[PDB]
From a paper:
RBDs bound to the fragment antigen-binding region of the S309 antibody (the parent antibody for sotrovimab) and human ACE2 explain the preservation of antibody binding through conformational selection, altered ACE2 recognition and immune evasion.
BQ.1.1 has R346T, K444T and N460K RBD mutations relative to BA.5. RBDs alter receptor recognition and key antigenic sites, we determined cryo-electron microscopy (cryo-EM) structures for each RBD bound to the human ACE2 ectodomain and to the fragment antigen-binding (Fab) region of the S309 antibody. RBDs (equilibrium dissociation constant (Kd) = 12.8 nM and 13.7 nM, respectively), indicating that the additional BQ.1.1 mutations, which map outside of the ACE2-binding interface, do not influence receptor engagement. The structures demonstrate that S309 binds to both the BQ.1.1 and XBB. Moreover, the reduction of S309 neutralization potency against BQ.1.1 relative to BQ.1 is probably due to R346T in BQ.1.1, as this mutation abrogates electrostatic interactions with the S309 light chain variable region (Vl) D93. BQ.1.1, BA.2.75.2, XBB.1.5 and BA.5 have similarly high ACE2 binding affinity, suggesting that their viral fitness is not limited by this step of host cell invasion.
Residue numbers in the entry:
A (entry chain L): 2 to 104
B (entry chain E): 334 to 372, 374 to 516, 523 to 527
C (entry chain A): 19 to 133, 141 to 613
D (entry chain H): 2 to 125
Amino acid sequence: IVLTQSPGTLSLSPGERATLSCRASQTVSSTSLAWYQQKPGQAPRLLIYGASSRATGIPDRFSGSGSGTDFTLTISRLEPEDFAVYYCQQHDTSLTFGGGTKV
Amino acid sequence: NLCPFDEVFNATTFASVYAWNRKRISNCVADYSVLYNFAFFAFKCYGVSPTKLNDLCFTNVYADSFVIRGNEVSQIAPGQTGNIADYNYKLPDDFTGCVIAWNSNKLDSTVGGNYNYRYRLFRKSKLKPFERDISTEIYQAGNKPCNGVAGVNCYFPLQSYGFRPTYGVGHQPYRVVVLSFETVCGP
Amino acid sequence: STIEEQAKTFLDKFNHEAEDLFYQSSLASWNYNTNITEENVQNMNNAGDKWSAFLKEQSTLAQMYPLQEIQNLTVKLQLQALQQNGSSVLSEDKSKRLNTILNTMSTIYSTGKVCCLLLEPGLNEIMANSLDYNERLWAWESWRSEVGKQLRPLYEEYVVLKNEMARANHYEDYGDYWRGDYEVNGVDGYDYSRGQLIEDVEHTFEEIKPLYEHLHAYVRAKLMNAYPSYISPIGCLPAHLLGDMWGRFWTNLYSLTVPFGQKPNIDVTDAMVDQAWDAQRIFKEAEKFFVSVGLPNMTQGFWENSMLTDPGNVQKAVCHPTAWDLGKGDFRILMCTKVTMDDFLTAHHEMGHIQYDMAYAAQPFLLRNGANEGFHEAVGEIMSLSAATPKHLKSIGLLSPDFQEDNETEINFLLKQALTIVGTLPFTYMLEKWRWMVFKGEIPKDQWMKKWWEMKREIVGVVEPVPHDETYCDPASLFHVSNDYSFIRYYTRTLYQFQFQEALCQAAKHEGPLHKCDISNSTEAGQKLFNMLRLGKSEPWTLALENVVGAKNMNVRPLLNYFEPLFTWLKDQNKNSFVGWSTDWSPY
Amino acid sequence: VQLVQSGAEVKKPGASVKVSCKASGYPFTSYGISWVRQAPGQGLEWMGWISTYNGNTNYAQKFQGRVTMTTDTSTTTGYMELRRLRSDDTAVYYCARDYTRGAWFGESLIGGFDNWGQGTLVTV
Ligand SMILES: *[C@@H]1O[C@H](CO[C@@H]2O[C@@H](C)[C@@H](O)[C@@H](O)[C@@H]2O)[C@@H](O)[C@H](O)[C@H]1NC(C)=O
Ligand SMILES: *[C@@H]1O[C@H](CO)[C@@H](O)[C@H](O)[C@H]1NC(C)=O
Ligand SMILES: *[C@@H]1O[C@H](CO)[C@@H](O)[C@H](O)[C@H]1NC(C)=O
Ligand SMILES: *[C@@H]1O[C@H](CO)[C@@H](O)[C@H](O)[C@H]1NC(C)=O
Ligand SMILES: *[C@@H]1O[C@H](CO)[C@@H](O)[C@H](O)[C@H]1NC(C)=O
Ligand SMILES: *[C@@H]1O[C@H](CO)[C@@H](O)[C@H](O)[C@H]1NC(C)=O
Ligand SMILES: [Zn+2]
């Protein structure tokens, strides 16, 4: 499967909502998709797993959802520390990452 | 090596009830500690309180995983009968172990209908404890052989569920893990 | 190996593949009713065709399991409902002819105009809200002559084709076919011939008629002050002056007939508004009502999937309070509610339907219904009687604790109820009597309009304003007649409604007048009713009734008792008036 | 729970590189080890997954042949050895602890990569 994310550069002012999308070329299991967050100069961390389940240690301002070939990630209120690069993943078939988006 | 009880409960997919998946756990310490501190609606047990199992060394632990309807969960208990208890998953009256079940409506259901799960609805005779048949041979109700053609008085046995997110609780999918205790010294 | 075994095997595959197909067509219909688009129409129709085709196929497989070789009642009850050939007993040409006639009749009624005003909101607005003899007569006569007359030719052929298939299906006539829905043969002591319905209906009517005659005299005496030169003191009331299009309900007359009009009735609309009630609150209160009597409360999916508020003008939903059961535990309500007393009571009615649907949800698909045609509505309807009672309102916060219920307001309430409940029975009885005779062939074609108007003045006490010829078809001007519906189900509903209430009040240990009974805080009455709801269609209605009322048939005593406090009052009002009517009198 | 990787290395084309990963704070044999890679200006590219119990390895489609994976339980350390380094093989190789595949049965799980190391830069 091939994952495509959009917009490539969703850079918006802090304090507002930020929504990212990840589209699949094929239908994938809703329990086999995850999101990662990579801050500048360092390793990425697991943000959301199982499409909607929040990873441990992650703030509750982050929420995920989706099904079929259309999955999304939303930040209820964008913080100064959220201006990072986000990636979507699927491991239903093999394991692949999306292109990634910069907020 | 602690026991692979995490990868049984957190598996992406569960087997269908007519063809349930038998996992064997052995040669490993088992922290049944999680077993009593999860929010797995039915941690029912039959003869062994979860408290003593962490002080018992079991030769083999078998984890039988499958998906059934909510109103069929009661058929997994020993001494029960019904379309699941008799034709799909037969559990003996002399049962030692625990039955764990939880709702999986957001995992095993789709809007168009999830038909990947199938149970047996017709059979010539009832099953014995812990056996299963996955034969798809045509069942004849009548007096004349149809030779594989599902015409009048011939039916395809394995019917299919059609799980959908808006069903009532009794018709929602549940993931059931039956732990049967027969090398596995719990801490 | 035998029919008993093969029959249950067949049904034990139908009852598992039929539910899925049913669900899909039920859901598609739901989506249409909540969201009307071209896309949803074709989706609804496609799913509908799949379900219909399915039943037609299974119907031809059920034929090889004859009831003669089947002993178990739970099998015979399911097969006999799945073995009936319907209209598919006639030749292909006759079958198609039948269906085109039946379709045509529906379009003439639903899309007919007069001048041009259609029926709604037009000829039913003039009929409901016009104190004008001549304007009313025009609206009445116009509808009858413009669309009623038009359907005469189709009704005649309709009767012939419908009666032919009835006989082909081994019935005496089409009326005999319909009465079969009350037939309970199979177990000794609870038997009931379908031909018996005619006698039992007639007998109950004669016992009630005395109440009707006093109510009739009262209403007539009041109408004479509105139409002082048209209504005669010793005759029948003109059909167009009963407050309706066909004279079915007299409820719109409750502005002329009010017993004590210087006092307001009980109305908590303002209280609901002042306390900031909303749609969610109205249904939550109805939900706890049922819990207090002893039933489980609405499921989560009732709150998440239902449409309890007007969706908007962008999503053009069809606003019409309906209780839905889509199958597999999916229960919903479709109802755009306002913060008013009318909807407050309606909410209990629709909630009552769901409680019944949930009680028999454990039954086989083919038995997953009410015992008969009246039982479903009767159990729902009784819920509004207790909800409207000022003992429930008094403790819900909507009624003030210094509101007193006077002698006078009890009468106002009872009349308004009688005017809607016992003013409709003569009509239902009459209409079905006529139709049965027409199908049986007791009435010549060119004399059935004669008997129609002849019996109206004998049973109902109503007459025509103007003479009509045999070219007219007055009965077909009504929805139920032109669209091939049974009507007797309304007669055998009101009677059950009161039988259940009287049976439950004594269980709840209510003392005093029945119209003041409340069934809340009582598990004795809650469990009593429940025990017949869980039955679905697995048992004869003559047994389901025994489980709550104790009777093995319908009665009138509970009805006459309910209105007893009004009847004695009416007797003291008709002291100086004639009770009854002369059939030799006419407006012309 | 921490993952500590070795320092940066410089290799010539055709050479092989072996990157170590030290795991501690958890039962080593209860979780697998995965190796994603990120080249400058690029996103992440999965290289493979290795069991710490059965030793089974699952490789990405275009790394089969070069990549070779192994673990040592006694010192709870993982290793990855890419081979025949090309010019395009310049990037930062991350060590990650996964919950995407079972370590004992090999069945897919509901999860992701729980813990990532600091990243090892390999120049070529
Ligand atoms: C099933 O998985 C649940 C989630 O585990 C947590 O999140 C995953 C992504 C990893 O980061 C893991 O290390 C975290 O603990 C557990 O809470 C739950 O206990 C697991 N089920 C069983 C029976 O162990
Ligand atoms: C109604 O149906 C249309 C399809 O024509 C769809 O686009 C729209 O979103 C639906 N609205 C709702 C509330 O489902
Ligand atoms: C009829 O069949 C049902 C099962 O559908 C069974 O429970 C019942 O006991 C049977 N009754 C008789 C008289 O065989
Ligand atoms: C239905 O039609 C079939 C075929 O003509 C016939 O055998 C059967 O008796 C009919 N059943 C009824 C109730 O008319
Ligand atoms: C009815 O539902 C309410 C939630 O509104 C709950 O608090 C109550 O306990 C339920 N009643 C019963 C008998 O379960
Ligand atoms: C029904 O029970 C509720 C809760 O105790 C109580 O407040 C209410 O007044 C009772 N209704 C009647 C008529 O007693
Ligand atoms: Zn109703």
